[PDB]
Amino acid sequence: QVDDEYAATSGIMDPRIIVTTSRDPSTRLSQFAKEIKLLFPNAVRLNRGNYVMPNLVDACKKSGTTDLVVLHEHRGVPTSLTISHFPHGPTAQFSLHNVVMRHDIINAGNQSEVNPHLIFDNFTTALGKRVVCILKHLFNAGPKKDSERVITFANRGDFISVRQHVYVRTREGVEIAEVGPRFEMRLFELRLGTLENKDADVEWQLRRFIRTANKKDYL
Amino acid sequence: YNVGKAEKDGEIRLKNGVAMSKEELTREDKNRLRRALKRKRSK
Amino acid sequence: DGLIKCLKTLDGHNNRLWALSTMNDGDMIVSADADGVFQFWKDCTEQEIEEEQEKAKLQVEQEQSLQNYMSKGDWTNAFLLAMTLDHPMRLFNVLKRALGESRSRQEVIFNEELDQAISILNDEQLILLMKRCRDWNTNAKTHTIAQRTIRCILMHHNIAKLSEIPGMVKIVDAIIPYTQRHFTRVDNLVEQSYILDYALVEMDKLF
Amino acid sequence: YQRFEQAAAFGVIASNANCVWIPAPGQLITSALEDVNIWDIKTGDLVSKLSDGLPPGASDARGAKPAECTYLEAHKDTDLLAVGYADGVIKVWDLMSKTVLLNFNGHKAAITLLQFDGTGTRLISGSKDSNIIVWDLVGEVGLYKLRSHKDSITGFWCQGEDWLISTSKDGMIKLWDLKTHQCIETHIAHTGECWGLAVKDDLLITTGTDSQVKIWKLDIENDKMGGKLTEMGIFEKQSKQRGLKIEFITNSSDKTSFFYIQNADKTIETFRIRKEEEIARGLKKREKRLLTEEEIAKSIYSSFILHPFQTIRSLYKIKSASWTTVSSSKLELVLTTSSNTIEYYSIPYEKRDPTSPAPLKTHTIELQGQRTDVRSIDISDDNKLLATASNGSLKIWNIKTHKCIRTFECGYALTCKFLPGGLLVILGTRNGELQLFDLASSSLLDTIEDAHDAAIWSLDLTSDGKRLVTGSADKTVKFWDFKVLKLHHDTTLELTDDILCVRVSPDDRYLAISLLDNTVKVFFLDSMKFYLSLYGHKLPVLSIDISFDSKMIITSSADKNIKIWGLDFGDCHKSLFAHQDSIMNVKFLPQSHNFFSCSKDAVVKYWDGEKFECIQKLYAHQSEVWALAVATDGGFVVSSSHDHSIRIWEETSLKAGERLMEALDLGIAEIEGLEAYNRDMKLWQRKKLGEAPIKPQGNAVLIAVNKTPEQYIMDTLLRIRMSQLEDALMVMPFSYVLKFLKFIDTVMQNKTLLHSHLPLICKNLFFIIKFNHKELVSQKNEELKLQINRVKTELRSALKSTEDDLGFNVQGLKFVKQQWNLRHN
Amino acid sequence: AGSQLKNLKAALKARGYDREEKKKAIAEIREEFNPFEIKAARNKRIAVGKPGISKQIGEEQRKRAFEARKMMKNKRGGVIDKR
């Protein structure tokens, strides 16, 4: 269920999201950030250049935005996303591994922009419930039950495959089609304060160099 | 005072204040009004 | 009670019943007795469906008559047939058409034959007419027809009769405040109709 | 793929429709299913089968049942046939070249009558949906749609251009003024339905549900509302069922009139109507005993003016009739009955005596039919065909001519087969009887009474033919040999349950028998070994088939699906769901694993046994397909059904503001054009009348929508919405504001549509001059000054006129309430 | 331009008890409306690769190579087929 720093405005209020790049982004990162801001609704994009992160965080959390997605690249290919929830909430920061984007591949039309449905596959641990809550409180509460776009966060051994599909329901089953960016993201750090400081207490971060590292998942 | 529903089942009174009688109205308007209050009874 | 086969239960009596003598001519008069009280049930289905089918025949004749009157003009006998059949949308149409042609041509507000036909209708007919006028007066569109019909009822009937008809206060209390609402609206229309007079005094000051 | 198609269809002579008669006795056009066939009564040979040019089963045949013909009608002199079908369409053909001239879809359900009117060029059509449509043939157009009935048009009668009169499947008869196309006079004819209508000009006659036939007097020149058609009295018939066609004639050579009422069952009641001389000389005789009582007796007319006649019966149930007459001793009446047969009767009458105790049929065309549904079809090697019926009409048709050349009488016969040399037929009947016939000689080689204790259900020969198997509903199968050409019962296998299908393999190997207990059993013929039991069908199970390799069987049932079984281990392969009613029969091809299945929902279906697709979905029948039979070699398949049919299958944008602006410009252009015309008329009537303007023709769209320009502008001003009205009035410039003021100035002279649009006119006009006030008070023209004054006076007069009665009604109604209060509060 | 969902509903109304037509139509619309398993370049004067299928065959190849080496790893015999 909804945990202790999201329970005040769980389904009362729509979110408000900023999507912004690292610093002087490449063009494929700008395309990627546009894809992320029209992946999830009531998100707008902000041109980070010459923005300091403390006064960016302060301007967001006094303008009333709920959360921030900061994107980091490597020569076009985007490599990280940090989700910072602003009312002194958590930052989950992820690395992105297999990114294929529609601006790269195909003019297949335009997207759908409906409040989507959400699939979460085997987030079994309490850290899984934590990352489910932080990933789905950046979506709009209560879609229509005939909304025809779904997105999926499927855990596959600590690598969250992230896709987006549109569907109709035909006579013999259901026919699916792939819209938007596919990923495997993986959480390398949670912490409990916002993005400004890095003096916040860590709820989880992966231990790469312990000798029992590759024995368990959500270690 | 406000316009309620009809008091007998031989007529209907719309909220407008105009009224039809079941026998008097044509069958095309009976289909139309059945469809209309079906939607009004569906929302 | 007595029941028949299953349908058509009978009222019976208050208590128990050891009696059924139904065996007159075909199955004529039936007799059924409680402890003391008798019952003598009448006949076969031979006229209570005949009077129903002949009132169906009469109704389908006068409906066609009303359609012919509504087509060819002739609003007075159309009005009284719509009042007899209780066809309220057709009643609104005959009153609206007759009122519009009354504004067209030229003490009297409809034509004289129709408002005499309104003047000679009885209590239950004028209570359903004033119920129709009641729920037409809730529009701001269909309210003028209601006001003309209310006015001819008021000036062609007896006011003591109209008051002592049972049911004519739950209608006139329903439609006093709607007429007051319309009086306020049309009076404000007359109020803001004087921009024409102001524009005329400016157009005359122009030289 | 080498697909299938339909070569020819036959077996039907008279189907579920009417019949028209053509003079040379004469010939007759009647209905087969979906195509019309013409017959000469004299001999009876099929001289024409006018059909659609597309074979049902081709590439472009659409995926539904074909439209069954339901009404024939004929124009004699100009030689046309207007036929109408069960979906609603009407095809009009020229009978010389037999092509389709006119297609007239129009309706929504099946149609019930046609009639040509003014003999050519006009056709009126009534249908099972309650509309009745007039069509022109020189314009290919539905002219008028008379639309006030409620159930289904059962008859009508028209004269040209002024009066139609219809009667429908509710209780109602209606008279229609065809100038205005509004119904004039409506009566309730009969308390249930109203099935009949005929009229000889003075009297009209109708019939309803049961024997009550009503005479009406139509007085066309009447003027009263109820009374164009009055009712003059009822009488009775001998049939208590639905009289459903009445028709009149005027025989010449004196002048006389006869009408018939055909019934539901078996019987046509004919009537002579008498003449005015015997009306006058019969009035006194019932006016004897000499007057209120005598007036009541004279009012209570039908038996007076109408005279019953020779009540013609028939063997079967009667579907349609029509006659011809000479001499009043040749009332010659053709009659199509339900069990497919036409019959030409003729009653004589010596003008006082009908000269016979019962009328006589002079012809009967019944050879190419069956009178019942064909419960079993069969085929030769390739040449002849076997049709098995319930009356007894075994018939041996031939493929190359579609004519029955040989026919016998058996009984309630449900299964049959040939014999392998040809020219010999085995058959079993629904009682405990079996029968044998041939082709060259007469009917009965021999019958076997007590062939079984109960109803036989299925028999099968062996592939050499010397030994046959009969399975019957007495819970037994029996085996029979052919001893020399007689039947030898030798062994009998009694089961626990009613066997209802048998089959052997095509190589003498297996005996598969379908029981009523939801299963089939496969035996070895050489041992009665009980090889297999195939189970799991879940309803009693109809036709089996064994493949040519004797490896694969089919199994049909009333579970709406056929199952494919592998016979080596008895293992199922598919359970494919076909056929949403019941699969009556299923048969392989000769050499392939493809097969056919015909079902109880009027469809045969072509499948393969490898991919188990449906190869083809053949859609030519109309009702329950009882049997089908495949050729022994080559593979063309015949199918025979419940609609008495046997058919062959072989191989192959402004917005508000600008809408108002363009409406204002054309409206005010028309308005001041007419005002200039009126000024021209006054000047050429007040001066030397030598010249004037020629003519302003009214506007195209104004006469097209039939509106005065004030009404045209008024309804587009209505049709803009209240949210964009303040924008629609703000977009338009001041020249359009000035002509808007001209429009308002003209519209408050017509005080009808001023008072019906007072707040709209007030809102628009006051916003217009309030927004454009700065420019309006700077215009210098006394025409506009007088315009504003005139609009002001008429508008304020209308508004004070409505609030006068508003205030009157307030004070009067509160007086009424207050005097009620001081009476009894 | 128009949505992939709108074009997918149009493709289903286009394609519409046969089975293989539905197998063909479903496989056709799946490999048509799945654009993320092809790769498209931009012609400077276009499906240029099939990434997932190439990946699947390149890793199944070395999977059977790895199982073959794991089978070989501690053997010492072998049949000598001179046929």
mmCIF file of N, CA, C and O in Angstrom, chain D residues 765-817:
data_model
loop_
_atom_site.group_PDB
_atom_site.id
_atom_site.type_symbol
_atom_site.label_atom_id
_atom_site.label_comp_id
_atom_site.label_asym_id
_atom_site.label_seq_id
_atom_site.Cartn_x
_atom_site.Cartn_y
_atom_site.Cartn_z
ATOM 1 N N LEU D 765 -30.546 42.455 -31.559
ATOM 2 C CA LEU D 765 -30.624 43.844 -31.981
ATOM 3 C C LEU D 765 -29.990 44.771 -30.960
ATOM 4 O O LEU D 765 -29.286 45.723 -31.327
ATOM 5 N N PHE D 766 -30.175 44.481 -29.675
ATOM 6 C CA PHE D 766 -29.628 45.373 -28.671
ATOM 7 C C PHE D 766 -28.136 45.183 -28.536
ATOM 8 O O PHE D 766 -27.427 46.171 -28.337
ATOM 9 N N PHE D 767 -27.631 43.954 -28.697
ATOM 10 C CA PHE D 767 -26.186 43.781 -28.730
ATOM 11 C C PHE D 767 -25.578 44.436 -29.956
ATOM 12 O O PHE D 767 -24.494 45.016 -29.865
ATOM 13 N N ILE D 768 -26.258 44.357 -31.104
ATOM 14 C CA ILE D 768 -25.724 44.920 -32.341
ATOM 15 C C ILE D 768 -25.596 46.427 -32.228
ATOM 16 O O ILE D 768 -24.529 46.988 -32.495
ATOM 17 N N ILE D 769 -26.649 47.107 -31.777
ATOM 18 C CA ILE D 769 -26.509 48.556 -31.749
ATOM 19 C C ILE D 769 -25.735 49.022 -30.528
ATOM 20 O O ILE D 769 -25.126 50.096 -30.575
ATOM 21 N N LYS D 770 -25.671 48.223 -29.465
ATOM 22 C CA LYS D 770 -24.838 48.581 -28.330
ATOM 23 C C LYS D 770 -23.365 48.462 -28.677
ATOM 24 O O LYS D 770 -22.550 49.267 -28.223
ATOM 25 N N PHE D 771 -23.010 47.476 -29.495
ATOM 26 C CA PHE D 771 -21.628 47.316 -29.919
ATOM 27 C C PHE D 771 -21.258 48.324 -30.995
ATOM 28 O O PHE D 771 -20.151 48.863 -30.981
ATOM 29 N N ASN D 772 -22.176 48.619 -31.914
ATOM 30 C CA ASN D 772 -21.921 49.539 -33.014
ATOM 31 C C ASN D 772 -22.505 50.920 -32.777
ATOM 32 O O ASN D 772 -22.861 51.601 -33.739
ATOM 33 N N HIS D 773 -22.625 51.341 -31.519
ATOM 34 C CA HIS D 773 -23.314 52.588 -31.212
ATOM 35 C C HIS D 773 -22.549 53.811 -31.680
ATOM 36 O O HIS D 773 -23.171 54.805 -32.057
ATOM 37 N N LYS D 774 -21.218 53.758 -31.685
ATOM 38 C CA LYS D 774 -20.427 54.942 -32.000
ATOM 39 C C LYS D 774 -20.549 55.336 -33.463
ATOM 40 O O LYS D 774 -20.576 56.527 -33.784
ATOM 41 N N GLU D 775 -20.661 54.358 -34.350
ATOM 42 C CA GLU D 775 -20.776 54.588 -35.782
ATOM 43 C C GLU D 775 -22.209 54.854 -36.209
ATOM 44 O O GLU D 775 -22.449 55.623 -37.153
ATOM 45 N N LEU D 776 -23.154 54.225 -35.516
ATOM 46 C CA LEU D 776 -24.567 54.352 -35.841
ATOM 47 C C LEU D 776 -25.057 55.769 -35.626
ATOM 48 O O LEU D 776 -25.774 56.320 -36.464
ATOM 49 N N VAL D 777 -24.646 56.395 -34.519
ATOM 50 C CA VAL D 777 -25.037 57.772 -34.233
ATOM 51 C C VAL D 777 -24.227 58.794 -35.005
ATOM 52 O O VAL D 777 -24.440 59.996 -34.829
ATOM 53 N N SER D 778 -23.290 58.356 -35.834
ATOM 54 C CA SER D 778 -22.590 59.234 -36.749
ATOM 55 C C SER D 778 -23.041 59.064 -38.186
ATOM 56 O O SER D 778 -22.648 59.868 -39.035
ATOM 57 N N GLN D 779 -23.787 58.005 -38.492
ATOM 58 C CA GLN D 779 -24.449 57.928 -39.791
ATOM 59 C C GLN D 779 -25.463 59.049 -39.937
ATOM 60 O O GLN D 779 -26.219 59.346 -39.011
ATOM 61 N N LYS D 780 -25.496 59.659 -41.116
ATOM 62 C CA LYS D 780 -26.436 60.733 -41.425
ATOM 63 C C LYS D 780 -27.333 60.277 -42.569
ATOM 64 O O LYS D 780 -27.019 60.518 -43.735
ATOM 65 N N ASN D 781 -28.448 59.630 -42.239
ATOM 66 C CA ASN D 781 -29.472 59.333 -43.230
ATOM 67 C C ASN D 781 -30.831 59.193 -42.569
ATOM 68 O O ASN D 781 -31.019 58.389 -41.648
ATOM 69 N N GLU D 782 -31.784 59.979 -43.067
ATOM 70 C CA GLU D 782 -33.128 59.979 -42.522
ATOM 71 C C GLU D 782 -33.858 58.671 -42.778
ATOM 72 O O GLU D 782 -34.805 58.360 -42.054
ATOM 73 N N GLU D 783 -33.418 57.892 -43.764
ATOM 74 C CA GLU D 783 -33.984 56.567 -43.968
ATOM 75 C C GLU D 783 -33.681 55.661 -42.788
ATOM 76 O O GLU D 783 -34.577 55.004 -42.250
ATOM 77 N N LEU D 784 -32.426 55.643 -42.345
ATOM 78 C CA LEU D 784 -32.070 54.855 -41.171
ATOM 79 C C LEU D 784 -32.660 55.442 -39.902
ATOM 80 O O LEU D 784 -33.000 54.689 -38.991
ATOM 81 N N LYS D 785 -32.803 56.767 -39.826
ATOM 82 C CA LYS D 785 -33.441 57.378 -38.659
ATOM 83 C C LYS D 785 -34.899 56.939 -38.523
ATOM 84 O O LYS D 785 -35.343 56.529 -37.440
ATOM 85 N N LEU D 786 -35.643 56.969 -39.629
ATOM 86 C CA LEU D 786 -37.015 56.480 -39.630
ATOM 87 C C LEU D 786 -37.075 54.979 -39.403
ATOM 88 O O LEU D 786 -38.020 54.486 -38.778
ATOM 89 N N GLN D 787 -36.061 54.253 -39.873
ATOM 90 C CA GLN D 787 -35.967 52.821 -39.639
ATOM 91 C C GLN D 787 -35.843 52.506 -38.159
ATOM 92 O O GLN D 787 -36.561 51.647 -37.640
ATOM 93 N N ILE D 788 -34.932 53.197 -37.467
ATOM 94 C CA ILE D 788 -34.726 52.980 -36.036
ATOM 95 C C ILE D 788 -35.981 53.345 -35.259
ATOM 96 O O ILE D 788 -36.374 52.633 -34.330
ATOM 97 N N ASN D 789 -36.657 54.425 -35.662
ATOM 98 C CA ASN D 789 -37.890 54.811 -34.977
ATOM 99 C C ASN D 789 -38.990 53.772 -35.164
ATOM 100 O O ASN D 789 -39.723 53.456 -34.218
ATOM 101 N N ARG D 790 -39.077 53.188 -36.355
ATOM 102 C CA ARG D 790 -40.122 52.210 -36.632
ATOM 103 C C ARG D 790 -39.878 50.907 -35.887
ATOM 104 O O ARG D 790 -40.810 50.332 -35.305
ATOM 105 N N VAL D 791 -38.622 50.445 -35.882
ATOM 106 C CA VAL D 791 -38.232 49.271 -35.104
ATOM 107 C C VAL D 791 -38.480 49.491 -33.621
ATOM 108 O O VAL D 791 -38.988 48.599 -32.931
ATOM 109 N N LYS D 792 -38.173 50.690 -33.120
ATOM 110 C CA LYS D 792 -38.365 51.005 -31.710
ATOM 111 C C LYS D 792 -39.831 50.934 -31.316
ATOM 112 O O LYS D 792 -40.184 50.290 -30.320
ATOM 113 N N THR D 793 -40.704 51.541 -32.128
ATOM 114 C CA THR D 793 -42.133 51.545 -31.831
ATOM 115 C C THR D 793 -42.728 50.140 -31.873
ATOM 116 O O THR D 793 -43.410 49.732 -30.925
ATOM 117 N N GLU D 794 -42.435 49.363 -32.922
ATOM 118 C CA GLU D 794 -43.054 48.043 -33.035
ATOM 119 C C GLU D 794 -42.499 47.063 -32.007
ATOM 120 O O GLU D 794 -43.249 46.256 -31.443
ATOM 121 N N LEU D 795 -41.200 47.151 -31.712
ATOM 122 C CA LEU D 795 -40.587 46.251 -30.745
ATOM 123 C C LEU D 795 -41.075 46.535 -29.335
ATOM 124 O O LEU D 795 -41.419 45.606 -28.593
ATOM 125 N N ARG D 796 -41.133 47.812 -28.948
ATOM 126 C CA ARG D 796 -41.614 48.126 -27.616
ATOM 127 C C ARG D 796 -43.105 47.882 -27.485
ATOM 128 O O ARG D 796 -43.576 47.551 -26.391
ATOM 129 N N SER D 797 -43.856 47.979 -28.586
ATOM 130 C CA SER D 797 -45.270 47.639 -28.526
ATOM 131 C C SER D 797 -45.471 46.150 -28.301
ATOM 132 O O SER D 797 -46.329 45.755 -27.506
ATOM 133 N N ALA D 798 -44.665 45.311 -28.960
ATOM 134 C CA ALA D 798 -44.754 43.871 -28.738
ATOM 135 C C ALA D 798 -44.355 43.491 -27.318
ATOM 136 O O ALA D 798 -44.993 42.637 -26.689
ATOM 137 N N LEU D 799 -43.327 44.145 -26.778
ATOM 138 C CA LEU D 799 -42.871 43.781 -25.442
ATOM 139 C C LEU D 799 -43.847 44.242 -24.367
ATOM 140 O O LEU D 799 -44.095 43.518 -23.393
ATOM 141 N N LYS D 800 -44.429 45.430 -24.521
ATOM 142 C CA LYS D 800 -45.429 45.847 -23.548
ATOM 143 C C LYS D 800 -46.716 45.058 -23.706
ATOM 144 O O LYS D 800 -47.419 44.828 -22.719
ATOM 145 N N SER D 801 -46.995 44.565 -24.915
ATOM 146 C CA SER D 801 -48.162 43.722 -25.121
ATOM 147 C C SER D 801 -48.014 42.373 -24.437
ATOM 148 O O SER D 801 -49.000 41.815 -23.955
ATOM 149 N N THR D 802 -46.803 41.813 -24.401
ATOM 150 C CA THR D 802 -46.681 40.557 -23.664
ATOM 151 C C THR D 802 -46.590 40.772 -22.154
ATOM 152 O O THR D 802 -47.162 39.974 -21.387
ATOM 153 N N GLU D 803 -45.964 41.856 -21.684
ATOM 154 C CA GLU D 803 -45.941 41.997 -20.233
ATOM 155 C C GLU D 803 -47.260 42.506 -19.671
ATOM 156 O O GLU D 803 -47.468 42.387 -18.459
ATOM 157 N N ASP D 804 -48.164 43.022 -20.512
ATOM 158 C CA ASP D 804 -49.508 43.346 -20.046
ATOM 159 C C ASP D 804 -50.243 42.106 -19.574
ATOM 160 O O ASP D 804 -50.799 42.081 -18.470
ATOM 161 N N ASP D 805 -50.255 41.060 -20.389
ATOM 162 C CA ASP D 805 -50.932 39.855 -19.953
ATOM 163 C C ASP D 805 -50.150 39.110 -18.894
ATOM 164 O O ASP D 805 -50.768 38.409 -18.090
ATOM 165 N N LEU D 806 -48.823 39.280 -18.844
ATOM 166 C CA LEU D 806 -48.060 38.738 -17.719
ATOM 167 C C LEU D 806 -48.506 39.346 -16.391
ATOM 168 O O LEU D 806 -48.769 38.623 -15.425
ATOM 169 N N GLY D 807 -48.633 40.674 -16.338
ATOM 170 C CA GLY D 807 -49.056 41.318 -15.104
ATOM 171 C C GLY D 807 -50.507 41.052 -14.754
ATOM 172 O O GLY D 807 -50.854 40.898 -13.573
ATOM 173 N N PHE D 808 -51.370 40.996 -15.774
ATOM 174 C CA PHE D 808 -52.756 40.574 -15.597
ATOM 175 C C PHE D 808 -52.837 39.205 -14.953
ATOM 176 O O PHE D 808 -53.595 39.003 -14.002
ATOM 177 N N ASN D 809 -52.055 38.252 -15.457
ATOM 178 C CA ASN D 809 -52.125 36.900 -14.933
ATOM 179 C C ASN D 809 -51.553 36.801 -13.537
ATOM 180 O O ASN D 809 -52.057 36.010 -12.741
ATOM 181 N N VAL D 810 -50.547 37.615 -13.205
ATOM 182 C CA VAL D 810 -50.030 37.629 -11.836
ATOM 183 C C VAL D 810 -51.111 38.071 -10.867
ATOM 184 O O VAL D 810 -51.405 37.381 -9.878
ATOM 185 N N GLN D 811 -51.759 39.200 -11.165
ATOM 186 C CA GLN D 811 -52.746 39.717 -10.224
ATOM 187 C C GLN D 811 -54.000 38.862 -10.183
ATOM 188 O O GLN D 811 -54.572 38.667 -9.106
ATOM 189 N N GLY D 812 -54.385 38.269 -11.307
ATOM 190 C CA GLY D 812 -55.547 37.410 -11.305
ATOM 191 C C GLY D 812 -55.317 36.110 -10.567
ATOM 192 O O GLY D 812 -56.179 35.661 -9.810
ATOM 193 N N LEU D 813 -54.149 35.498 -10.752
ATOM 194 C CA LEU D 813 -53.895 34.225 -10.101
ATOM 195 C C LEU D 813 -53.680 34.398 -8.613
ATOM 196 O O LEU D 813 -54.116 33.551 -7.823
ATOM 197 N N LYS D 814 -53.061 35.499 -8.194
ATOM 198 C CA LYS D 814 -52.960 35.692 -6.761
ATOM 199 C C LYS D 814 -54.275 36.142 -6.149
ATOM 200 O O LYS D 814 -54.508 35.856 -4.975
ATOM 201 N N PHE D 815 -55.177 36.746 -6.929
ATOM 202 C CA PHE D 815 -56.534 36.954 -6.435
ATOM 203 C C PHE D 815 -57.269 35.636 -6.249
ATOM 204 O O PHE D 815 -58.010 35.477 -5.275
ATOM 205 N N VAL D 816 -57.118 34.709 -7.199
ATOM 206 C CA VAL D 816 -57.779 33.409 -7.108
ATOM 207 C C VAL D 816 -57.300 32.655 -5.875
ATOM 208 O O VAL D 816 -58.105 32.155 -5.077
ATOM 209 N N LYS D 817 -55.979 32.621 -5.678
ATOM 210 C CA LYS D 817 -55.405 31.964 -4.508
ATOM 211 C C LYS D 817 -55.822 32.655 -3.216
ATOM 212 O O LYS D 817 -56.144 31.990 -2.226
#
